[PDB]
């Protein structure tokens, strides 16, 4: 059980690898990561860049849910976790803020909307199927993919090596099948 | 329209 | 002082990494 550069490669791997692989089930980690990443580095990306990301993960979160036919009462408290009422950066500006939490309520009254059964639910759920599918999230995908490009020029030479190194530690006496997540973030990032 | 999480995520 | 040197530093929660590294294998 690690720490430094590669405890951050490990979570930004397994990250790349759930956004790439559309686990919904997984965003919530996802977000974690991300939120333990502006907590010591709000350098790494602009607020704008860091909150279009993390809100698409959150309303994926939430879109899933619906979608999967969960009861509504569990739909509104992911919701209202996700969003709540309330409530930085030398730019974090008042026009990205503005639309930043303009994007938040029409969200939430959206799905508040859903979850009173309207007569034409059906219409609405296909539309809001199509509204966060493939395209939003190819774009969500770039988003993070920038986000980790900004990680790897903050940490120092990357070294394939470490996650074998720990894994045998966790697991001793066990053969380790190489990881496909970790090397396909090691050939995305460019590494030698 | 009001900005929404999907148009937002798709622009720039 | 500086944002490299800032990052390294980073520790992540417990369980985010238990996660990580199970999922990863």
């Excluded at chain 1, 500006?93 to 309520?105: H, N, P």
Aim: hydrophobic content about 45%; aromatic content about 8%.
């Amino acid at each position: 059980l690690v720490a430094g550069p590669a405890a951050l490669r490990f979570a930004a791997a397994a990250s790349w690898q759930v956004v790439r692989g559309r686990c919904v089930e997984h965003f919530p980690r996802v977000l974690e990561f991300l939120r333990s990443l502006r907590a010591v580095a709000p350098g790494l990306v602009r607020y704008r860049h860091h909150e279009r990301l993390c809100m698409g993960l959150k309303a994926k979160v939430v879109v899933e849910l619906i979608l999967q036919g969960r009861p509504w009462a569990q739909v509104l408290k992911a919701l209202n976790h996700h969003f709540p009422e309330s409530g930085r950066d030398p730019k974090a500006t008042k026009q990205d803020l503005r639309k930043i939490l303009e994007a938040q309520e029409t969200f939430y009254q959206q799905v508040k909307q859903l979850s009173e059964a309207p007569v034409d639910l059906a219409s609405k759920l296909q539309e809001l199927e199509q509204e966060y599918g493939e395209p939003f999230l190819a774009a969500m995908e770039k988003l993070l993919f920038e986000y980790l490009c900004q990680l790897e020029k903050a940490l120092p030479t990357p070294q394939a090596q470490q996650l074998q190194d720990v894994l045998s530690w966790m697991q001793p006496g066990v053969s380790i099948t190489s990881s496909l997540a970790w090397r396909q973030y090691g050939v995305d990032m460019g590494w030698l | 329209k009001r900005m929404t999480i999907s148009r937002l995520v798709l622009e720039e | 002082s500086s944002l490299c040197a800032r990052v390294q530093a980073a520790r992540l929660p417990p369980q985010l990494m238990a996660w990580a590294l199970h999922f990863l294998m």
